[model samples]
Target chain A: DRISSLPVPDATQVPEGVRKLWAKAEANIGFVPNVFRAQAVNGEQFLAWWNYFNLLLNKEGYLTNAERELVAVVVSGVNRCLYCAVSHGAALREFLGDPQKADAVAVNWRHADLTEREQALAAYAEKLTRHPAEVTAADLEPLRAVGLDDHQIMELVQVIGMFNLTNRVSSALGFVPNPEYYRQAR
Target chain B: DRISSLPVPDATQVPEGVRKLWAKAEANIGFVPNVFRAQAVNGEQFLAWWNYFNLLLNKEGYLTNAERELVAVVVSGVNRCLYCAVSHGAALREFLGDPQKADAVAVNWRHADLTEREQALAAYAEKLTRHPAEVTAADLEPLRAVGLDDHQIMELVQVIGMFNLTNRVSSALGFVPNPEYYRQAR
Candidate 1:
């Protein structure tokens, strides 16, 4: 399947936790993501990572799921991570209930018809992704102006950090999105 | 004292775990890393991140400490993260016992006098960091040619992923590196 250069661990080779996770994903989504299989070769590490990633992206936090997905798409677009840009693009579309806006965001959020708050968040994510070294304390003023509380700002930065991490992992290994992501929420 | 744009919690405001960790860093390294203070605005979240980051980066892994630091510098450099690039550049020099080589890598790895294996690893890291969508299965060939096994490859990618995560977090929040890093390992 050329999903990864390393061997994709089968059920027997992976930990019971990984197998259970895979089963849950398959049941919930009808297919296991290539990352689940590709990362399973190092089962324990994968589980450790999933614990953090799941908490940050999939769990409830300071931001709505749609807002978090907006950050995800923006960061992935800047990093040019195909797996995340496509898969999370589906998530953004589903959460926002606007496929066109989500698609525009996946290409360039600046051109999308986002609310002032969303524009602020998208601008912060893009600047962080593209010009990290140039960011300063003044950057937070826009986020504050957009009505983000300390907790929400914290969540926003962590979500941005989470996508940058996943984008690199997914891209570095050439992890492919489940073909199903292409049709989901479209 | 203002290490982060957000309010940084002191010992009284932070959880016990954060206080102890800060103490340990100061005692061991003679200074607290800027990240420790910068990320402490959300105490519990900071601890969770540290648990994952410490396990992945500081604990023993398939790759040597120097090799991991090498990848860290390369990835941080690609992201143009001053905090990580300067801080890890010091760690890399101390581990490799070559300040000039480490400095060159922080600027541009291609100009550094790296061994063939180091070059392969750095090149892969740069490509994955700078052009994630462009990486493919063929990109793994050079790593294989350099004699990295599956486990090593897994660890390498995770290290790269970790830095990208931390780089964005540090940059987005404008976390500053401790000045000590500048004069270290010279």
Candidate 2:
């Protein structure tokens, strides 16, 4: 099945690094994400992007993985990105241990049963995603009110930014999530 | 004079890399961009993002600088990011050598006097920005018909993605544009 508008490059056409990364994903997750194949059409660029993306999303950060996933779902939801919204929805559920809440966030985070911190984060993400021109310095007050320090605030912004990047790439190229993403953590 | 909702770090607080970058910007552009100070709150991560951003937006690529800036302005307009829209608007005007046309693109690319290829690219950027869920494999046909090759398409999508990323970052943190952006190429 076609996972992208562009042709997904075969292994032989990609670099050794890309092939190894694919192997690692298949070994660890039991399926390679469509993004892995679709983006590898430009192997070095994809690798550079993945290096930054992995460090931001997967590595340890000031924000918890659950918190970062919340931002991801919020940004993707605002962009209406099917791939990141679906895949990260699963990750959010697994991290939060709450499928109902994760699903609610994917639709409208305002309606989700969230703590003040989550609500603040979601509100910020939605406004930034939809009405960026209206944002001002006062916007960070709610985040600070929720106990997010400078470091956490820094991380939070990057996570939101990263999803915006991924959401566009996934949507522009027409990436489809693996069926495994739908089933995992549900 | 503040550029961010969070505290903008002073030169003493940021890494040497960030300080050097700021100095370079001042020397080259004659004014430090708000993004420089605002993002340097987390100096290392800011540098990482700048490295990728500089490579994609400023370096030689499959797309022309004007084409890349067109994508940047379109995505920024869709996201309604004041900082990027204003700053990159100057870039677009300079690159296209038509301030009136560049201004129209900021309002609506569909209303601008664009070539078939530019229109196709702008349409795709708008769709991916505002309606990602609706995009599909068929979207590539318009691009192909306009003579964009596989590599160009790949670069185009990445450019769109990069703006979505930067738009959120600028808007979420309330990064203001430099006054210099407003007067350039006008």
Candidate 3:
């Protein structure tokens, strides 16, 4: 009955906007993500967060969706957020069209055979996610050498930071991934 | 001139809302925090982020500002985010009216003598910040034992997650803290 440590509100218990978001997801994706329900414990706060999250990840971004999801899975794997690693892992699998590669990135990205661009992104993702304090200007060199311009680098940083946020939320709250994510895009 | 790696927009180059926000911070805080300008490379994106951040940290919430800032400093110090460690560390210092304890919390919270409630929160902050994947339902027990209710726990998780997000952004971009934070509330 519990998807998180905190009490999850019934759809009816949430505000109208939250109800609509749930309905929209159910209609479009066939199931509302557990995060939507779990986080709606505070409706306006959830909306405010999603405004940024959706834009950063789901909308048209400077990095391709495939590239962004690649970073998401790498960061999630480093943080070991079950929900994010599973969900975004599936997204990366579908985007890259290779479940094996996605699995490699999820558990340990260095194991994957990736393009120089992807490898660069994953390396930076690991550095920022694991040893944030040690990250310095020199780290940007690899990214720039991979041809990421200012816009893309800025966007990549946000994408990396977004996962850090979601990973912490999902991990701290014990967000259970929707079952669909396990079999998704495989 | 560079506060961030990516190109920072001039005050005039940013959106009207971003300009207003910068001016507001200057009016109230005496100096615009470097993060405001550094993150404004993407104006609307920065605004979206700050919308939730301001609501969570500045506005009245389930957790007192002092409690929230305490957790913020703990997480920041753990992440080694220079910008957050300096800025929120200052806020925590002022809130608690003791620079010694704040500095202790910033370096190693265990070294500080804290009340039972503060100790519980710091333990949770360290666990969730350091090894998030290892968190379980039982972790909430300690917090509840310290008298935190559902809303308060949710807010605490967000505070922890928000710091993780900001820490990555600041560290990834090499955001420098305003010098004022160093000397203020000392």
Candidate 4:
């Protein structure tokens, strides 16, 4: 009940790739996230998704780490995804070195006391989250006004995007966040 | 403008990985999809996404090809993703060998003429698409009643999930579907 709605795979039940990644999480973060365990029903598929996910969220790319996690929490929060909101909320708070702003953004970035750039990011991310099909170049003009270039905009959408993916996967499967996610970076 | 609101990358503008896929698509599908061209700003990320997507959508999986495309159209339709609905609608139409039911699911699967199994898949797809955070095991019960196993359920959620991501990205970026999607399988 705590892991997922579907049956979960233990270390021995999962693929070799999944087993190694689970060990990495135990070593790196002190826990393998529930998503890692819950999603292993399709071990090879989870492995592929993890490789794609590793690049976008786990590593630095066109945007800064804090910026990426900022978009992460924004979309996950708006989506009401319990797992991502708690997990990425921790990451965002740690990255910003301020729990208050992270919690505020999770509640509502509109009143989160953000800089102009952060305002643009939160605004664009919320718009992209809630009304993706209606977004236009007009909506993107603000990010450009805030000095986001092509690369940054591309990275921002992908960040906003995978949360849409992972949020649904975690939430639909009823994945409970690891307990450590709540305490760390508090 | 017909491609995407963002700058479309020419073959030379993309990485070698991106170019190879484009050529393969041109050779196989007769024309490259607008999305493949539109998402080329981050070639490496796009490549990773493609590998995962290919395994899930293009190969024989836990679900039949028709069942996968059925879920695809259901999610894409509900999300109002212009590109995915059109493209995957075409795929669904051909897979089912009937355009009416395919288009019917696109408009609203609740009213579509479908068997009990297809009805279950459509209902589940729409629910997971619209209310990811709210879905419980109660919601997934119908799929099992329709004879879906754990692996099918896992693949089903991922298919529904990636469309959630792709729907946002394609719509937010203003991707226009190729003309070929409209006439094929009509």
Please write out the lDDT profile of model 3 over residues B1-82, one tens digit for every residue.
6677777788788889988988899999898988888888877788889999998899877899889989999999888888
Give the chain B TM-score achieved by candidate 2. Answer: 0.97
Top model number, lDDT: 3
Write model 4 residue lDDT over B29-120, tens digit each, in one string. Answer: 99899889998888888888888888889987899888999999988887788899999999999999999989898988889889999999
Candidate 3 per-residue lDDT over residues A97-160, each given as its tens digit = 9999999888787888889988999999989888988999899999999999877888888898
In candidate 2, how many Å is residue B168 off? 1.9
Q: Judge candidate 2 at residue A145 and give its lDDT.
A: 100
Each prediction's TM-score versus the true structure: 0.92, 0.91, 0.96, 0.97
Could you tell me the TM-score of candidate 4? 0.97
Give the per-residue lDDT of model 2 (tens digit) for A1-186.
878878889989999888999999999989998888988887777877877788778877688899999999999998888889889998999999989989999999889989999999999888777776677768888999999998888888788778877887888788889899888787
DockQ of the candidate models in sequence? 0.63, 0.62, 0.78, 0.76
Residue B130 lDDT in candidate 1: 70
Alpha carbon lDDT at A108, candidate 3: 82
DockQ of candidate model 3 = 0.78
Clashing pairs for predicted structure model 3, backbone only: none
Model 1 agreement with the true structure over B12-126: per-residue lDDT tens digits: 9989999899899999999989888878777767787888778777887678888999999999998888889999999999999999999999989899989999999999888
Error of 1 at B32 (Å): 2.8
Score residue B148 of candidate 3 by CA lDDT.
Answer: 95
Compared with the true structure, all predictions reach lDDT values of: 0.86, 0.86, 0.89, 0.87
Two-way DockQ contest, 2 vs 3, winner: 3
Q: Model 2 - which docking category? A: medium
What interface RMSD, in Å and to 1 decimal, does model 3 have?
1.0
